[PDB]
Amino acid sequence: MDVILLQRIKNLGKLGDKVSVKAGYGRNFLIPQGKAVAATEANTAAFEARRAELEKQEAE
């Protein structure tokens, strides 16, 4: 699956990078625990549109 990282991951990328991961990884660890979001068009519109700066200065 294709995901956009909401918050920093050790090897995937940082704060909004779009990466492809194995389906189980995203389905069972990232998405339920809020560490990423699915890379759909509406979710992208949501991510860069408004809450981008909020995720940014919530660096820690």
Partner RNA sequence: GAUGCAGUGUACCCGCGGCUAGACGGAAAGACCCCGUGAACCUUUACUGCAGCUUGACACUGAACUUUGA
Does residue 50 interact with RNA by CB under 7 A? no
Shortest approach of RNA to residue 27 CB, angstroms?
A: 5
- Separation between Cα atoms, residue 29 and residue 27, nearest integer Å: 6
**Is 27 one of the binding residues for RNA (CB under 7 A)?**
yes
Rounded Cα–Cα distance for residues 9 and 35 (Å): 8
Of 29, 43, 45, 56, the one binding RNA (CB under 7 A) is 29
In the complex, which residues of this chain contact RNA (CB under 7 A)?
11, 21-25, 27-29
